[PDB]
Amino acid sequence: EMRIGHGFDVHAFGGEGPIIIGGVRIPYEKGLLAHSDGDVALHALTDALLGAAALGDIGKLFPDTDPAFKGADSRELLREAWRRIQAKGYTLGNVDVTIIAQAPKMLPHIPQMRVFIAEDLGCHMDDVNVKATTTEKLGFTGRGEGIACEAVALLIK
Amino acid sequence: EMRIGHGFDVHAFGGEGPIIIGGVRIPYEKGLLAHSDGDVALHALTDALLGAAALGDIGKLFPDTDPAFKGADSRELLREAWRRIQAKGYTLGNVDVTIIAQAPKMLPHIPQMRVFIAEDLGCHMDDVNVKATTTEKLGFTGRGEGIACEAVALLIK
Amino acid sequence: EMRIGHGFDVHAFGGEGPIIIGGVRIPYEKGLLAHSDGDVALHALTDALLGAAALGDIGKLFPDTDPAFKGADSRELLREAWRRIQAKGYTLGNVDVTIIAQAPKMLPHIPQMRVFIAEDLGCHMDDVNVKATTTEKLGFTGRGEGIACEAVALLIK
Ligand SMILES: CC(C)=CCC/C(C)=C/COP(=O)(O)OP(=O)(O)O
Ligand SMILES: Nc1ccn(C[C@H](CO)OCP(=O)(O)O)c(=O)n1
Ligand SMILES: Nc1ccn(C[C@H](CO)OCP(=O)(O)O)c(=O)n1
Ligand SMILES: Nc1ccn(C[C@H](CO)OCP(=O)(O)O)c(=O)n1
Ligand code: NA
Ligand code: NA
Ligand code: NA
Ligand code: NA
Ligand code: NA
Ligand code: NA
Ligand SMILES: [Zn+2]
Ligand SMILES: [Zn+2]
Ligand SMILES: [Zn+2]
């Protein structure tokens, strides 16, 4: 039994940097409006992992309106979701994340993102891929209004 | 042999509600312009299933311009595509769907979506995940101009 | 060991046609601004293949700012990436690509795209799916400002 999962998240720019993406603190000239980290890459990833296990998603698992969690960085949410996710018998296959942003430049940060993720999920660095791409100045992402990430996850049970 | 598939669909808001998403009748203040249901979640899913079997997509399989089908709800299209899809030897792995909409709220409807889908594909409820996410007021989806869904499917042959 | 991968690319319309998509020369009234082919479908696909192998992405592998490659069509980049990708022990599972464009019409070109891809990756035509979809006149893609593609890839090691 192998299980595929998809996640997608978005945040708007606002206030002052830096931002956190994939756990890394990246300097930039806005920060991200969010009730949390606003770490889009770990949000999308967490959702791909939950979706592959059919556990729903962050929003279900962790209500903005709910307890225990409202004081939360996205790396604890990820580690919590994974903790549930193994409790149903699952194990990691691989994981591939696509950050979609006009800036800032993600590339140099991209190794450190992967050690955070690989550590949080207990796997090897090489079950984790991350890339970033622009939308060439089209779209809300191209106008620098915010930042999207998609992710995919393969779980083995 | 395992086979991965991706689908993506979009519809514009217009006219009066409710909408159908994932087979469920959801009350809302616009409805969806479409030559059909305008059920974005079953359209994207159907495409992820067809793509994983390399059968193309709805638009190929069922021309807006073509017969037998023009009088069609998206749940029959899904069941037809699946019917083809098993005829080439395939069997269901799992399926994860991401509705992207500012409103309405999908969450409460999300169990019933899954019994429709699981039934239509003949699997267990737990080979089916559905989530919805906002784009935080950016984008055509954030401006409430319409509604996008992505889906992924794993088939076993 | 099976490995899943995701890619996403975008290009803006500008200048005179035709465009190249999936290797095919498609007549149209704008062409695509790009430092290269501007073939969005092979870019997204190449990234899904690289991501599944955890090799990063085109942009890493082939700097716009870097050598050996600046004189490059997207079909050589694809064949190069695949060439790396097998060097780490990987083999093709399947591949499903979703072109997102208001025009031109991709459908008639879609067989020939698949023989290019299948050939470039050395597989059968039927490990390759391609579809195109519109965003119903919403979005930068619906306003005909440019052209997006997503892709997913399954690799066997
Ligand atoms: C999976 C994804 C990210 C698909 C395409 C994204 C898309 C068309 C986003 C909205 O663009 P937009 O916000 O430019 O529309 P608007 O023109 O209103 O800014
Ligand atoms: N926000 C972003 C978007 C893309 N990238 C990677 C990409 C280089 O890999 O930037 C170079 P590009 O301008 O050629 O896309 C990046 O590192 N950060
Ligand atoms: N249209 C949508 C969009 C998102 N959701 C789920 C999400 C709660 O899970 O809504 C809460 P959010 O406002 O915190 O995103 C939803 O249920 N319906
Ligand atoms: N640019 C595009 C977008 C979609 N398609 C396929 C689709 C028919 O399959 O066009 C018909 P549609 O207008 O019903 O979507 C296409 O062939 N080219
Ligand atoms: Na979110
Ligand atoms: Na949040
Ligand atoms: Na459609
Ligand atoms: Na339709
Ligand atoms: Na690009
Ligand atoms: Na390019
Ligand atoms: Zn988020
Ligand atoms: Zn549709
Ligand atoms: Zn490109």
Side-chain angles (χ1 to χ4, degrees), chain A residues 9-11 33-39 43 58 64 74 77, chain B residues 136:
Chain A
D9 190 6
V10 171
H11 281 287
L33 308 167
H35 283 289
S36 47
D37 179 359
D39 189 328
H43 298 151
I58 308 173
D64 292 350
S74 305
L77 297 166
Chain B
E136 299 284 7

Side-chain angles (χ1 to χ4, degrees), chain C residues 81-96:
Chain C
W82 188 233
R83 173 168 312 116
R84 320 279 195 73
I85 277 166
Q86 305 186 276
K88 299 295 182 186
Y90 283 109
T91 216
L92 195 77
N94 67 309
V95 175
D96 187 21

Side-chain angles (χ1 to χ4, degrees), chain A:
Chain A
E1 186 173 352
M2 295 177 59
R3 304 203 60 101
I4 206 207
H6 175 268
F8 179 70
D9 190 6
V10 171
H11 281 287
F13 281 122
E16 311 171 346
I19 70 200
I20 327 295
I21 303 278
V24 185
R25 174 182 261 239
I26 296 171
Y28 187 56
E29 291 105 58
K30 323 173 168 179
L32 283 173
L33 308 167
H35 283 289
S36 47
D37 179 359
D39 189 328
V40 291
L42 308 183
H43 298 151
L45 177 57
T46 286
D47 284 359
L49 295 159
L50 293 177
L55 313 176
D57 62 290
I58 308 173
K60 189 140 154 291
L61 254 74
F62 320 121
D64 292 350
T65 266
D66 275 0
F69 285 143
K70 189 178 183 285
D73 54 13
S74 305
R75 276 187 72 196
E76 300 172 323
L77 297 166
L78 173 58
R79 277 185 311 255
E80 183 41 32
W82 188 233
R83 173 168 312 116
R84 320 279 195 73
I85 277 166
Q86 305 186 276
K88 299 295 182 186
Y90 283 109
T91 216
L92 195 77
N94 67 309
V95 175
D96 187 21
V97 175
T98 303
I99 308 162
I100 309 169
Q102 195 69 35
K105 191 150 89 86
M106 307 291 162
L107 181 57
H109 302 289
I110 265 187
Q112 180 62 42
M113 272 178 213
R114 286 172 72 215
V115 299
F116 280 158
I117 290 160
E119 189 170 354
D120 281 354
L121 296 181
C123 50
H124 300 316
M125 284 227 345
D126 97 289
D127 298 320
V128 182
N129 201 78
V130 186
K131 68 222 161 255
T133 185
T134 70
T135 61
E136 299 284 7
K137 291 262 187 204
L138 309 168
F140 70 81
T141 172
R143 291 194 301 277
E145 289 160 23
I147 203 163
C149 182
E150 296 202 56
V152 290
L154 193 89
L155 303 181
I156 302 125
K157 189 171 181 190

